[PDB]
Design a protein around this ligand. Structure first.
Ligand code: HEM
Ligand code: GGJ
Length: 394
């Protein structure tokens, strides 16, 4: 006898398990067991993944309900699950969106300067360099301090919460609450700090004292700051890191993008499509009985939308494992989700990776792994797939 198929399949972010394609072909929605012991429906075809993400009866916010089957334990207060919904309800969506676009004056120049400085320091210190801890993550952290309008020197301490905050754990995590409460107190202080007048926290600080927002809670304002810094940093840092591995693994692509930098946006779009940075499917709770493929999903059941299921589906992306810069449907991947909860940071995330890669290829055109790829150490029971260190030479 055998037990029910368990998720996740593998913490390795450098290759997709052969199992995904077999599953997609034979059972593109099927029952699995999560690390909590709960049952869930795993959805792995492009067609069924988009169906679920485009049907609001598959609810994000209801995943936080007491007694629901769980993918993993909450690491935040249940209100945080619906942070974007609460932002919308408070009348803050347009202002938040505007604050996190990469189009702010001087932001792209800032990103370029920061990337080049990080890379110069690596070159000075001499190979091997760790491109995650000493390039991609610090670039993400610096970017988000700038976008939030908070001091650069505060970045590292906020960053160190994240190795716990974005755990994917069977059980509640005591350190997560300690760090969450501390970070909320920090952001509350930021809102009271008269020197904070730019970026997202600058704008929130202004709106907080505007009569049109006098009944928006200080808890929500602080929560937006902690949530957007943390989710933005973990998402951009982890994506850029695993995109760099994909690029290093492809010397011909690396050379083409070095030679023709104008192709980098199209390269980044394919790197997004093939990216394995999400460690778990996106969870949703059914709020009605809903037919998905051959399965009638029942009210109250957990559904997991497997992003690499959709994104490597050959029916939608022929030769899915290949980076092709001339696809006719290049942004139709699900790396930023789809529907009601489409990532509001998508433009910023694109620009972070484009500028990071452009700088790296200019400074280190000969970049290569300094260790056999199997020697990368993949973080386990985490919401992202990332190597603990990314040693390179050039
Ligand atoms: C390469 C970078 C990024 C990737 C791959 C990414 C990916 C995603 C995905 C897949 C979702 C949908 C989750 C779901 O439907 O369950 C999402 C939502 C979200 N993202 Fe991102 N993200 C990135 C960058 C950012 C940045 C830079 C920010 C903010 C500074 C951000 C903030 C958010 C927020 C607040 C949501 C929730 C939206 C909602 O519930 O309506 N993300 N992201
Ligand atoms: C800052 O630390 C956090 C840890 C977990 C969450 C969290 N727990 N459960 C849910 N639902 C969320 C959440 C809330 C808002 C946005 C995102 C999210 C999810 C995927 C990608 C990106 N960029 C953001 C996730 C939020 C913040």
């Amino acid at each position: 006898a055998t037990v029910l198929l368990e998720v996740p399949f593998s913490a390795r972010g450098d290759r997709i398990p052969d199992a995904v394609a077999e599953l997609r072909t034979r059972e593109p929605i099927r029952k699995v067991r999560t690390i909590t012991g709960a049952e869930a429906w795993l959805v792995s075809s492009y067609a069924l993944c988009t169906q679920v993400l485009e049907d609001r009866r598959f609810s994000m916010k209801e995943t936080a309900a007491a007694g629901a089957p769980r993918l993993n334990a909450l690491t935040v207060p249940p209100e945080v699950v619906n942070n974007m919904g609460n932002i919308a309800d408070a009348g803050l969506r347009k202002a938040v969106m505007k604050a996190i676009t990469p189009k702010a004056p001087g932001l792209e120049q800032f990103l370029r300067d920061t990337a080049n400085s990080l890379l110069d320091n690596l070159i000075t210190e001499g190979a091997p360099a760790d491109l995650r801890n000493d390039f991609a993550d610090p670039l993400a952290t610096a970017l988000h301090c700038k976008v939030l309008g908070i001091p650069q020197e505060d970045g590292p301490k906020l960053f160190r919460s994240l190795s716990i905050a974005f755990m994917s754990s069977a059980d509640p995590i005591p350190a997560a609450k300690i760090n969450w409460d501390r970070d909320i107190e920090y952001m509350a202080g930021i809102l009271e700090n008269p020197n904070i007048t730019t970026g997202l926290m600058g704008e929130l600080s202004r709106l907080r004292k505007d009569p049109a927002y006098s009944h928006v809670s200080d808890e929500l304002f602080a929560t937006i700051g902690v949530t957007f810094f943390g989710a933005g940093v973990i998402s951009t840092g982890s994506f850029l890191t695993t995109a760099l591995i994909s690029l290093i693994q492809r010397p011909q692509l690396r050379n083409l993008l070095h030679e023709k930098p104008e192709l980098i946006p199209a390269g980044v779009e394919e790197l997004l499509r093939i990216n394995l940075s999400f460690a778990d499917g996106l969870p949703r709770l059914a709020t009605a009985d809903i037919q998905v493929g051959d399965v009638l999903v029942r009210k109250g059941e957990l559904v997991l939308v497997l992003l690499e299921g959709a994104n490597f589906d050959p029916e939608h992306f022929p030769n899915p494992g290949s980076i092709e810069l001339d696809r006719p449907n290049p942004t139709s991947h699900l790396a930023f989700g789809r529907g009601q909860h489409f990532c509001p940071g998508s433009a910023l995330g694109r620009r972070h990776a484009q500028i990071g890669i452009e700088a790296l290829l200019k400074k280190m055109p000969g970049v290569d792994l300094a260790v056999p790829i199997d020697q990368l150490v993949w973080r386990t029971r985490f919401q992202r797939r990332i190597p603990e260190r990314l040693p390179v030479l050039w």
